[PDB]
Amino acid sequence: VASKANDAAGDGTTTATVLAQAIITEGLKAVAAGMNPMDLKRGIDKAVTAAVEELKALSVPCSDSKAIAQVGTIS
Amino acid sequence: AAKDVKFGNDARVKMLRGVNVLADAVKVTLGPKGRNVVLDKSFGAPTITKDGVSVAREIELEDKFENMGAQMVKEVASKANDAAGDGTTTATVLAQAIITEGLKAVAAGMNPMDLKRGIDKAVTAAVEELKALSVPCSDSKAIAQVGTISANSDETVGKLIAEAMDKVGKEGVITVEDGTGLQDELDVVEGMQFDRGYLSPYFINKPETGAVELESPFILLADKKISNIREMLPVLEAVAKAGKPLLIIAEDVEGEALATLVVNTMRGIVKVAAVKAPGFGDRRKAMLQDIATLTGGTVISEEIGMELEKATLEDLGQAKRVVINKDTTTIIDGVGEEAAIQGRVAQIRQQIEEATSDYDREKLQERVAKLAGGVAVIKVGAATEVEMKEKKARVEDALHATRAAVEEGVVAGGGVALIRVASKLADLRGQNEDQNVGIKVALRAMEAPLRQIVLNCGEEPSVVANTVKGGDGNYGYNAATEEYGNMIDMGILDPTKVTRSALQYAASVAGLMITTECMVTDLP
Amino acid sequence: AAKDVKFGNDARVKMLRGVNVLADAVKVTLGPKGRNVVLDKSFGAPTITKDGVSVAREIELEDKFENMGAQMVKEVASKANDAAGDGTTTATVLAQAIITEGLKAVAAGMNPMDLKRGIDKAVTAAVEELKALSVPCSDSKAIAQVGTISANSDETVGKLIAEAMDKVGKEGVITVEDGTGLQDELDVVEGMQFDRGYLSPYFINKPETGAVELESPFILLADKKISNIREMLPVLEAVAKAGKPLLIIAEDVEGEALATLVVNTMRGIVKVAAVKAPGFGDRRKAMLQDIATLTGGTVISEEIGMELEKATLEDLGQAKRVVINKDTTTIIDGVGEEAAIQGRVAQIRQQIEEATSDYDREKLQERVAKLAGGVAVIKVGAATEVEMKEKKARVEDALHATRAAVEEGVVAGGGVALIRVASKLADLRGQNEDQNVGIKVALRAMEAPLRQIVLNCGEEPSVVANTVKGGDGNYGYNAATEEYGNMIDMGILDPTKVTRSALQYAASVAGLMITTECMVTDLP
Ligand SMILES: Nc1ncnc2c1ncn2[C@@H]1O[C@H](COP(=O)(O)OP(=O)(O)O)[C@@H](O)[C@H]1O
Ligand SMILES: [Mg+2]
């Protein structure tokens, strides 16, 4: 995850890693509760396809020099 | 003594294994078709047994901790039996079922406090459901019914119990003695029982019952706390040369004279036993005087000046028998004059005229009850001595289940009742998703006994379980004959008390463990 | 005996682990929703408990050093309880909090002596803040209030305490006895209590209280130091054949006769106990004569010629009860004549006319007080014996918290008070940057109890902590019901004495450790 995140945008690799550790922790806990892992997956994926649409909706264009300097700086 | 302390997970894992060894050894004996456990015995040949209570008693593990696990379940499952008359194994079997699944849950990273809540709810709910499934046992017909079944199809055992209850009441005290002829006998006789047990296990002279049986002994009725053995020497030397046992009823008996009387009996000259007096404070005064009257004995009150050093046989009470156990003393046939016992009744009955409180009226009534009410004795008749003390044993078994059947009724016996109540509350929810798991753990635990009976029989559990669940009420599987039917009709029943007690007691120790964070014990 | 010596860091690391095992085992039980600790017991089934005092008592480690750590915290937390009535656990939990964080600091290379200064300031300041947060408890209404809450919503317990204090004063001696009926009783009776404890723990006959309870014993009032057991043989043989206990009050009792009386009771014939006389020098003369008068006994002064070999029962005093603990003796109902006790009062009252010093006047007054002031006894009534000695226990609990509430008032009980005082002094500075760390270590240690209560309940600590901080005064979280509110209104309160004591005591041992450079012990 950490690696692909990087080939993709060259940033957010830590975030990615943090999310994965988190999906895994929680998911495995639910597998121990006796849930069906293939469904836990389908749920996770549905949740995500939805999240991505949500993000594309929150996204506002970054086009002025100030905004660009801001992403640069934060990075 | 330096201790070994274990925390959280370690603590609980040790506990789990401890309990598993207990349960795995004890559970294989559950059905009507249990497997054998071989129990070594220092001298001579080993013991082959299918009796869970016997197996349990032997379980003690090397790993302290692991041991503590096992000993904990043992303790509580024995209490189940203490209060119900059975279930020791069932309780253990269920105890494992919750502990296993709950304990996995905590270890997976769910909340212990919630898991307990869920289990506890699931139990509360099932206990209710049990009351609903429960078929009453109230009339003489029903009494004799559960008696006969509980005594293994023997219709005459059912009869004798029904008759005893028919004579002294469902509450009245019924005891069992060895029979003198081939004929059964039922006699009612002046006597009494009170909720007070032996002061030392070393008083037990019938190891198989965990009980003290004393043959027509003298009874000492002191009123002080017997601490010194000195007060005894006159009375303990008269009842020595009289070649008879001696029962002591007083405030208490402190080590100084207790530990002496203990070693004095367990391989020693005068064989005796002592128990605390019934009641406390202002009650015990008259409550002890009642037993005096009943046994024609004299009460040695310090508040009058008399001491135990100033006492002879003429002061001691007398009764043709007396049995003590863990927590009950019952005296049988008191030599106290009829003119006296009926006289005391007249005194107390009058005293009820006071009616200053519904507590005082009811408390004086309980006293009239014990005294004039009497004790019903069953003498078990048989052809041979082997048959005799065997039939005698089943009569005691049946009496147990019947007293229990009266109180809370009976239900499907094969595990069935538990399987049933569980499939009923299969929507049950909590608030935490963690409490759900709690409820489910508990629910699925309730299938354990049936699944185990079936397994022991060499049949498929899942298959029998599923079809028992498919039904309703007391429809079940009779592992003995492999037919489905109405378990009660088929004569496979447990008193409600016992199935409940088993469950509640299993649940208690499981919750306790699921919430244990620390464990302290001695160094290996 | 060759020793093993550890220095500086080694020494402290060992100490830390020692304390951590103590605290980690004891702390899991803190809340109204504690977890269980399983405590093995040689024979029989283990003990499951949520009682930190019980857990602590068992903790002793193999690694000496590590053990010394644990034992040190144990000592000091028990003193907290000694002086306040509670907090044993809380003290431990806070003790860890400081020790952990302070001890990291020292190891990081900061100055121990400053770290102590900072902690000690933070504490001094918080103790003040506590006095400010404190709500008084003075009138009968307030007494009964904290009583009832401290006795678990039982309004009748609050009443009886309020009534007792209403009879013999907020100072007056109040004891608790087993009840004879169903009714509570409150009687005032001639007696006395003085700050002097048993000479040997082996005198304890009630292991659960760590106390000596003797039933209407004779009282020996010697005036010399009892060293030889020879002086005893006449009196110790009369009180043997009298079948009664015996209390000894004299200068002291030296091993020669102490160690003999010790083994003479712990599994032996005459069961007795002895304590030192109250006061020293010229005071003890009359101070002992007071007890004589009160018990109608004779004082055996060597300065008169009488010896203990020249003493019979007629010389011994008498009282219907007497309880001794670690450091208190209180005698209940002395048989001394009214004409005598009132006579002695008249003698002493007159003697106050002297008024040569505000020390002599006040000292003769304390004597009049004990003698004519009397002792108020509560008899706890109940329906069953189990209920009885249970209710009796909560009455003693409540009495404890009430005596403490009177002295220093009450505050928010959920850890809350501590969390509060901490968020108040959150600017506090020292001079060393090292002293700051000291203050901060201490401040943040004050959140430990709340954080822990919350944790034991399975809720988030940080979140509950933050919102308790967000409020004012006695706003807090009630872990039992999970509602925020006014802790005092909601009936969750600690006497101010106990919260303070706990804090101060934890702070003492923490600083002691942070300033420890060497540790000497025996070789493994
Ligand atoms: N001032 C700040 N306060 C809160 N979040 C910040 C701040 N500055 C940067 N971040 C966030 O921290 C995240 C960290 O980026 P970084 O540490 O490089 O993780 P990654 O490798 O996943 O990019 C970014 O997602 C950004 O949103
Ligand atoms: Mg980044």
Q: Which amino acid is at B314?
A: E
The token duo for B318 is 């007398």
Q: Do B522 and C267 touch (CB under 8 A)?
A: no
| Cβ proximity of C442 and C118 under 8 Å | yes
| Cβ proximity of B174 and B376 under 8 Å | yes
**Widest pairwise Cα distance in chain C:** 75
- Distance CA(C394)–CA(C382), nearest Å, equals 13
- Distance CA(B464)–CA(B483), nearest Å, equals 10
- Distance CA(C204)–CA(C206), nearest Å, equals 6
The token duo for C140 is 């009968």
Cα Rg, chain B, nearest whole Å: 26
- Distance CA(C149)–CA(C487), nearest Å, equals 12
Query: Does A touch C (3+ CB pairs < 8 Å)?
Result: no
Nearest CA in chain B to A28: B108
DSSP letter, residue C430: -
List every span in chain B annotated with CATH 3.50.7.10: 191-371
For B181-195, the DSSP string reads: SSS-EEEEESEEEES
Q: Which amino acid is at C452?
A: Q
Q: What backbone torsions phi and psi does residue C477 show, to the nearest 5 degrees?
A: -115, 130
For C144-201, the DSSP string reads: HHHHHHHTTS-HHHHHHHHHHHHHHTTTSEEEEEE-SSSS-EEEEESEEEES--BS-G
Q: For C8, how many CA atoms within 13 A lie in the half-sphere containing its CB?
A: 5
| Continuous segment of H or E residues that includes residue B69 | helix B66-84
Q: Which residue has the tokens 């009829």?
A: B338
| Continuous segment of H or E residues that includes residue B300 | strand B299-300
> What is the atom index within ligand 1 of the atom nearest the CA of A18?
22
Cα Rg, chain C, nearest whole Å: 26
List every span in chain C annotated with CATH 3.30.260.10: 135-190+372-409
Sheet containing strand C185-189, strands side by side: C173-178, C375-380, C185-189
Residues facing B252 on adjacent strands = B225
Of C500, C317, C289, nearest to C405 by C-alpha is C500
| Cβ proximity of C375 and C192 under 8 Å | yes
Q: Is A26 in the pocket of ligand 1 (CB under 6 A)?
A: no
| Cβ proximity of B273 and B213 under 8 Å | no
Q: Is A11 in the pocket of ligand 1 (CB under 6 A)?
A: yes
Residues facing B49 on adjacent strands = B37
- For residue B369, what are the contacts with CB-CB under 8 A and spacing of at least 6? none
Partners of residue B259 in chain C, C-beta under 8 Å: 267
The token duo for B243 is 């070649």
Q: Does B520 touch chain C (CB under 8 A)?
A: yes
Helices B8-26, B66-84: crossing angle, 10 deg rounding:
50
Protein residue closest via CA to atom 2 of ligand 1: A74
Cα dihedral B230/B236/B238/B244 (nearest 10): 180
- Distance CA(C12)–CA(C65), nearest Å, equals 9
- Distance CA(C194)–CA(C375), nearest Å, equals 12
The token duo for B438 is 């709690």
The token duo for C258 is 């102490």
The token duo for B132 is 């609903």
Pocket test for ligand 1, best of A1, A7, A15, A55 (most atoms within 8 A of CB): A15
Protein residue closest via CA to atom 4 of ligand 1: A74
- For residue B312, what are the contacts with CB-CB under 8 A and spacing of at least 6? B234, B235, B238
CA distances from C21 to B7, C7, C30, C96, C489 (A): 9, 21, 15, 10, 36
| Cβ proximity of B118 and B445 under 8 Å | no
| Continuous segment of H or E residues that includes residue B220 | strand B218-222
Strands (E), C402-517: 410-412, 475-478, 483-486, 493-495
Residue of B517, B521, B522, B523 to mutate for C, most C C-beta atoms under 10 A: B517
Residues facing B518 on adjacent strands = B7, C37
| Cβ proximity of C421 and C126 under 8 Å | yes
Query: Does C touch B (3+ CB pairs < 8 Å)?
Result: yes
Q: Which residue has the tokens 């002031």?
A: C373
- Distance CA(C78)–CA(B319), nearest Å, equals 53
- For residue C143, what are the contacts with CB-CB under 8 A and spacing of at least 6? C137, C158, C161, C162, C165, C402, C405, C406
Number of Cβ within 10 Å of residue B305's Cβ equals 7
Coil, helix or strand at residue C426: coil
- CATH fold, domain C1-134+410-524, is GROEL; domain 1 (1.10.560)
Pocket test for ligand 1, best of A11, A62, A74 (most atoms within 8 A of CB): A74
Helix and strand counts by DSSP (H, E) for chain A: 4, 0
DSSP letter, residue B521: E
Residues facing B473 on adjacent strands = none
Resolution in A: 3.0
SS (H, E, C) B105-166: HHHHCCCHHHHHHHHHHHHHHHHHHHHHHCECCCCHHHHHHHHHHHCCCCHHHHHHHHHHHH
Tell me, rounded to whole angstroms, the distance of Cα C108 from its chain centroid. Answer: 38
Q: Which amino acid is at B146?
A: V
Q: For C156, how many CA atoms within 13 A lie in the half-sphere containing its CB?
A: 12
CA distances from B27 to B49, B452, B500 (A): 12, 7, 18
- Distance CA(B21)–CA(B444), nearest Å, equals 21
Q: Which amino acid is at B92?
A: T
| Cβ proximity of C81 and C87 under 8 Å | yes
Of B7, B281, B516, the CB nearest to C180: B281
Q: Is A15 in the pocket of ligand 1 (CB under 6 A)?
A: yes
Helices C8-26, C88-108: crossing angle, 10 deg rounding:
150
Residues facing B73 on adjacent strands = none
Method used to obtain the model: X-ray
Q: Which CATH number applies to C135-190+372-409: 3.40.30.10, 3.30.700.30, 3.40.50.12160, 3.30.260.10?
A: 3.30.260.10
Residues facing B485 on adjacent strands = B476
The token duo for B141 is 């017909």
| Continuous segment of H or E residues that includes residue C255 | helix C255-265
CA distances from B280 to B459, C185, C422 (A): 55, 16, 51
Of B516, B521, B480, B450, nearest to B107 by C-alpha is B516
| Cβ proximity of B408 and B497 under 8 Å | yes
Coil, helix or strand at residue B477: strand
The token duo for B81 is 């039996």
- Distance CA(B403)–CA(B323), nearest Å, equals 18
Parallel/antiparallel/unpaired status of strands C410-412 and C493-495? antiparallel
**DSSP H helical ranges for C85-154:** 88-108, 112-133, 140-150
DSSP letter, residue C278: S
- For residue A53, what are the contacts with CB-CB under 8 A and spacing of at least 6? none
Neighbours of chain C (3+ CB pairs under 8 A): B
Tell me, rounded to whole angstroms, the distance of Cα B96 from its chain centroid. Answer: 22
| Cβ proximity of B420 and B470 under 8 Å | no
Of B195, B345, B358, nearest to B279 by C-alpha is B195
Q: What angle do CA B329, B335, B336 make, to 5 degrees?
A: 95
| Cβ proximity of C188 and C375 under 8 Å | yes
Partners of residue C383 in chain B, C-beta under 8 Å: 359
Instruction: Dihedral sign for Cα C476, C482, C483, C489, please.
Output: negative
Partners of residue C59 in chain B, C-beta under 8 Å: 3, 5, 520
Which CATH number does B191-371 carry? Answer: 3.50.7.10
DSSP letter, residue B203: G
Instruction: Dihedral sign for Cα B275, B280, B283, B284, please.
Output: positive
Parallel/antiparallel/unpaired status of strands B516-522 and C36-39? parallel
The reply, when asked if residue B184 is annotated as ligand binding, is no
Q: A70 alpha carbon to ligand 1 midpoint, in Å?
A: 12
List every span in chain B annotated with CATH 1.10.560.10: 1-134+410-524
Q: For C254, how many CA atoms within 13 A lie in the half-sphere containing its CB?
A: 9
Q: Which amino acid is at C243?
A: G
Of B64, B282, B518, the CB nearest to C181: B282
- Distance CA(B493)–CA(B471), nearest Å, equals 17
| CB crowding C261-281: b at 16 or more within 10 Å, else e | bbebbeeeebbbbbbbbbbee
| Cβ proximity of C198 and C279 under 8 Å | no
